[PDB]
Structure formats: structure tokens, C-alpha cells
Amino acid sequence: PDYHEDIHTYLREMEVKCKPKVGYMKKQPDITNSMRAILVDWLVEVGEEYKLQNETLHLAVNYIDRFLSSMSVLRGKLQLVGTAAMLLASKFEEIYPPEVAEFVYITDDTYTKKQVLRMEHLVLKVLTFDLAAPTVNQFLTQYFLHQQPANCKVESLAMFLGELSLIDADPYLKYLPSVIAGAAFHLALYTVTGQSWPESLIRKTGYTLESLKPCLMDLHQTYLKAPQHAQQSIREKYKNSKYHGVSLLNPPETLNL
Amino acid sequence: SMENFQKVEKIGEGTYGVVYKARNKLTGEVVALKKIRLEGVPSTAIREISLLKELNHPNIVKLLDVIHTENKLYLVFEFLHQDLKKFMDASALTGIPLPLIKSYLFQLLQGLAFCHSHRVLHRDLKPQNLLINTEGAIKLADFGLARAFGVPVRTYTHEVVTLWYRAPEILLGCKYYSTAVDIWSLGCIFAEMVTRRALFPGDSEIDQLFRIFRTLGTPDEVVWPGVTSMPDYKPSFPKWARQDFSKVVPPLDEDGRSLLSQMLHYDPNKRISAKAALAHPFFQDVTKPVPHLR
Numbered sequence: 001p002d003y004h005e006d007i008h009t010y011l012r013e014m015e016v017k018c019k020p021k022v023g024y025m026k027k028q029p030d031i032t033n034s035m036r037a038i039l040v041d042w043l044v045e046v047g048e049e050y051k052l053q054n055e056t057l058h059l060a061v062n063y064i065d066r067f068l069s070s071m072s073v074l075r076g077k078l079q080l081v082g083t084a085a086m087l088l089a090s091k092f093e094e095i096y097p098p099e100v101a102e103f104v105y106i107t108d109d110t111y112t113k114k115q116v117l118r119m120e121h122l123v124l125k126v127l128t129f130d131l132a133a134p135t136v137n138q139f140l141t142q143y144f145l146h147q148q149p150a151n152c153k154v155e156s157l158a159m160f161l162g163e164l165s166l167i168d169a170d171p172y173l174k175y176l177p178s179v180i181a182g183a184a185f186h187l188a189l190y191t192v193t194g195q196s197w198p199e200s201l202i203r204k205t206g207y208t209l210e211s212l213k214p215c216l217m218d219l220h221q222t223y224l225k226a227p228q229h230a231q232q233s234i235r236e237k238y239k240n241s242k243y244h245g246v247s248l249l250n251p252p253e254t255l256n257l
Numbered sequence: 258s259m260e261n262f263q264k265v266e267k268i269g270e271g272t273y274g275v276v277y278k279a280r281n282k283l284t285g286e287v288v289a290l291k292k293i294r295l296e297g298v299p300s301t302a303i304r305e306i307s308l309l310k311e312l313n314h315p316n317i318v319k320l321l322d323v324i325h326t327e328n329k330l331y332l333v334f335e336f337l338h339q340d341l342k343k344f345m346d347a348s349a350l351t352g353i354p355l356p357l358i359k360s361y362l363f364q365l366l367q368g369l370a371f372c373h374s375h376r377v378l379h380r381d382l383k384p385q386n387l388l389i390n391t392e393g394a395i396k397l398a399d400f401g402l403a404r405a406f407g408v409p410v411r412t413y414t415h416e417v418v419t420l421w422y423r424a425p426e427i428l429l430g431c432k433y434y435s436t437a438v439d440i441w442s443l444g445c446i447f448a449e450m451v452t453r454r455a456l457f458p459g460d461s462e463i464d465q466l467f468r469i470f471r472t473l474g475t476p477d478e479v480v481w482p483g484v485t486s487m488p489d490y491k492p493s494f495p496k497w498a499r500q501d502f503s504k505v506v507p508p509l510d511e512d513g514r515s516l517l518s519q520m521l522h523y524d525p526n527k528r529i530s531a532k533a534a535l536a537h538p539f540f541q542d543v544t545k546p547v548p549h550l551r
């Protein structure tokens with residue numbers, strides 16, 4: 001309470017520094033947006049199986065995008081980068097992270113324990129141990145405190161939309177976590193209650209519906225096309241009563257911005 | 258990498274790894290070396306390194322370098338000369354002068370406020386982890402038990418904090434704990450610097466709670482709303498009266514007593530923040546003298 005403003009300010013600084021290179025996928029010879037989408041969808045599955053925090057998923061994705069921003073990776077090694085990143089994210093964030101053996105098992109035994117452990121080392125080296133990165137999730141939980149009154153469906157729907165943004169590098173790589181969270185919270189709020197991005201958050205973030213619009217237009221489309229998207233693990237996940245079955249909710253046809 | 262360092266002696270053993278005093282041969286800089294023998298890289302090291310690289314403050318031990326050699330991970334820190342615990346033992350017959358206690362507390366609160374403002378919980382404040390130098394600085398060390406927290410907090414690890422410095426909300430098992438647990442530890446350390454004995458030296462969780470209750474009163478719903486509902490609260494708990502707070506740390510005068518009581522408030526919401534404590538009247542005459550010893 002006495003530190004909310006300081007922390008928010010600090011996270012707004014760090015998200016800029018911790019940001020992946022926007023055009024990195026063009027510079028990768030062997031991997032595509034589609035291959036990355038498959039990877040992230042599989043990580044969602046992994047998180048579901050081991051009951052991992054949503055924050056762990058968001059961190060792992062940040063580690064991967066940052067790693068791939070400087071390191072060229074062949075398609076057959078992409079899943080290894082993804083596996084080490086999720087191991088690292090689990091160690092950072094989880095009370096009880098899964099053991100390394102459990103990460104070897106879920107890779108269908110494509111890789112050995114020694115490969116996973118060497119890739120952990122490399123990821124840490126390449127990221128220079130900077131793992132406390134801001135995520136969409138970390139901004140969402142702060143934005144949730146501005147609901148009047150609190151609504152569980154809005155919260156889960158915001159998390160659902162924020163999670164979908166992880167799947168598609170084009171176009172979400174160009175948006176900062178705080179901005180994506182802004183769009184996601186507004187979209188969830190509007191879908192459930194008919195309400196809009198509140199004045200108190202303009203005050204906090206400096207963002208308005210005008211500055212959120214570009215991201216919001218993209219997120220609206222992704223929401224509309226979600227049942228037809230090739231990757232479905234997030235929709236399946238958000239059917240569960242843990243997240244109030246919010247993926248069953250109908251998107252709005254228009255946003256009237 | 259390790260070529261330029263000459264080991265001097267072992268200092269001790271923290272959360273994990275071994276710390277050595279060493280000297281940079283080219284610059285002359287004396288450093289502390291945390292050696293980690295390599296389940297992969299430990300989460301405690303992953304947390305410590307990532308957090309310490311963000312935390313740059315005069316009252317937080319400075320991480321200087323991270324060296325990945327063949328089979329081992331070496332962390333290079335600024336060297337400090339002694340821990341607070343050994344310093345208190347050296348003060349057995351003279352005591353610690355008030356200006357020094359006051360200066361140390363003020364510095365620790367600065368260190369803590371910076372941590373909390375950067376979403377970091379230390380979760381292991383105790384005299385052995387508080388390091389002093391010859392110029393009068395005191396610094397937070399051993400971030401192996403630390404973590405980055407969210408706003409609002411989730412449930413985190415329930416093990417946390419060495420028993421003697423462990424907050425009531427941890428002992429009573431609340432779903433959520435936050436920055437207040439570090440403040441509780443500092444309050445215990447404030448009392449300790451004055452009396453030079455531990456405030457609540459229990460050897461079990463129940464013994465710890467009862468010692469706290471006998472000093473501050475058994476908390477009721479008035480002093481701490483929700484307490485009777487907490488997981489590890491028992492209605493059979495003895496109901497001790499809150500004693501004259503001036504009898505808790507007798508040498509302390511009005512301003513110091515006031516600050517200690519705000520640091521040892523039962524309700525984590527009412528417990529003073531490190532940031533707010535910096536402006537307490539207790540610190541109106543604060544200076545930064547060198548240690549009166551060694």
C-alpha cells in the first residue's frame with residue numbers, strides 16, 4: 001500500500017529494459033512465428049499439467065523472446081530453449097518447482113537431462129541472470145485493485161486475453177506488458193460489465209482509451225478469432241472453474257471507441 | 258576470471274555456498290567470494306543474483322561480478338569487515354553507544370525501504386546477515402532467502418525467517434504475508450542492539466508465539482481483526498496481559514519506545530513501513546559515526 005506507486009513506477013522502467021527485440025523473427029533463419037506459437041501453446045499445457053503459476057508462464061515466454069533476440073536456433077532445438085526457460089521460470093517463481101527429471105519427461109524424451117541443464121546455463125549466460133522481468137500478469141493484478149466492485153469474471157477474462165497475446169509474436173511483440181494489460185483489462189471489463197478503463201487508472205498509468213486503442217483493436221480481433229486459432233490450449237485451460245469458465249463468454253461484436 | 262583473485266580465509270556459510278575473503282591482485286580490492294558447487298543452478302542463487310543486480314544501494318551488499326568457470330559459480334561481492342552479531346558480543350561490557358544503534362537502525366530502514374520499493378522481500382533479517390564496516394556503514398546481506406513479490410501478494414513459501422525474528426502472521430499461518438515481516442525482524446533487532454540479547458528466543462513455533470504473547474499481550478480481535486480465524490490460532494491460547502512497554506527494552510526513552518512499538522504491532526496493516534519509519538522523531542538527531550571498536 002505504501003509501496004504500490006514506487007513498485008508500479010519501477011516496473012514501468014524495467015519493462016522497457018527487459019523488452020525483446022521487435023523484429024527478431026525475421027532475423028531467425030529456421031524458426032517462424034508459427035513455430036513459436038506452437039512452443040508457447042505447449043508451455044501452456046506444461047503449466048496446466050504441473051499446476052504452475054500463470055506468472056511462471058509469462059516469465060518463461062519473456063526469457064524465450066529475449067534469448068531468441070540474440071541467439072539463432074534451429075527448429076529441432078526450439079523446444080529445448082523453451083524447456084530450460086520454463087525450468088528457470090519455475091525456480092524463480094514457484095514455491096515447489098518441478099524437478100529437472102519432470103522437465104525431461106514432458107519433452108517426450110527428445111532431449112537428455114544433460115542437454116536441459118547445459119541449456120539452462122546458456123540461457124542464464126545470454127540473459128546475464130536478469131530474470132526478474134515485468135509481465136502482463138504483474139500489471140493486471142495491480143489494475144484489478146481499481147475495480148468497483150471486484151469481479152472474478154473480469155479478472156479471469158483479463159488473464160485469459162493477456163495469455164492469448166503470448167501466442168502471437170505478430171503483432172504483440174511490439175506492445176509493452178503494461179499496455180497489453182491495459183487493453184486486456186479494458187476488454188474484459190467491457191465484455192462482462194459494459195464498463196470502461198476507469199479514470200483512476202488514467203491517473204495511475206497515464207494511459208487513456210486513445211493510447212490503448214491500437215493494442216485494443218488487435219486484442220479485440222484475437223478474441224473474436226480465438227475459437228478458430230490453430231493453438232487451443234489457452235481456451236481449454238480457461239474453461240476450468242478455477243478461471244470461472246470465462247473462455248465460454250461471447251466476445252463483443254464492437255467496442256464503440 | 259579466478260586468476261586475479263587470491264583467497265585469504267573462510268568467512269562462513271550462508272543459505273547456500275561458501276563465502277571466502279579474497280583480494281583482487283591487480284587492483285588491490287578486497288572482496289567476498291561466494292562459491293557455489295554445481296539439479297542445475299539452485300533457485301536460491303537464481304533469485305539472489307537476479308535481485309542483487311537490480312538492487313544498487315549503499316545499505317545493500319553490492320554484487321560486483323558473476324563468474325561462470327568450469328564446474329563452479331563464483332559471486333564476487335564488496336567485502337565487509339564484521340557481522341552485527343559478533344559486534345554485539347564484542348560490546349558485552351561497554352554496550353553499544355546510542356548514536357551507533359540509532360545510525361545502524363536508520364541505515365537498515367533505508368536498505369529495507371529500497372528493497373520493498375523494488376518489490377523485494379528479504380525474509381531472513383538477523384544479526385548474522387547484517388554486515389558492518391570501519392567507516393560506520395551497516396548493510397543487508399545474504400539474499401538467498403529473498404524473493405520478488407507481486408501487488409497484491411500471492412501465497413509464498415511458508416518456511417521463511419529464522420525463528421527468533423519470525424513475524425506473528427507467519428507463525429499463525431496467514432494466507433498472505435508481505436513487507437511487514439521484514440519490519441518485524443528489524444524491530445526484534447532494534448531491541449537486541451539495546452539489550453544485547455534476543456527479544457524472543459524460542460525453540461519451537463508454539464514457544465515463539467507464547468514468548469511474543471507474554472511481551473506484547475495475547476492478540477484479540479480488537480488489536481488484530483481476523484486473528485481468531487487464522488489457521489494456527491487456538492482458542493486455548495493463554496491470554497496474557499500486555500505489559501508496560503517501557504519494561505520491554507528499559508534503556509529506551511520515549512521516542513525509541515514509540516518506534517519499537519510501531520515496528521512490533523501485531524496487525525501487519527498497522528505495522529510501520531520502513532519508508533515511514535525514516536521520519537520518526539527518534540531519528541531527529543541521527544548521525545553516522547564509525548564503530549567505537551576495532
Ligand SMILES: NS(=O)(=O)c1ccc(Nc2nc(OCC3CCCCC3)c3nc[nH]c3n2)cc1
Pocket residue numbers: 268269270271272276289318334335336337338339340343385386388398399
Ligand atoms: N563473522 S565475522 O564477523 O567474522 C565476519 C562476517 C562477515 C564478513 N564479511 C562478509 N561476509 C559476507 O557474507 C558472509 C556470510 C556468513 C554467513 C551468513 C551470511 C553472511 C559477505 N557478503 C558480502 N560481503 C560480505 N562480507 C566478515 C567477517
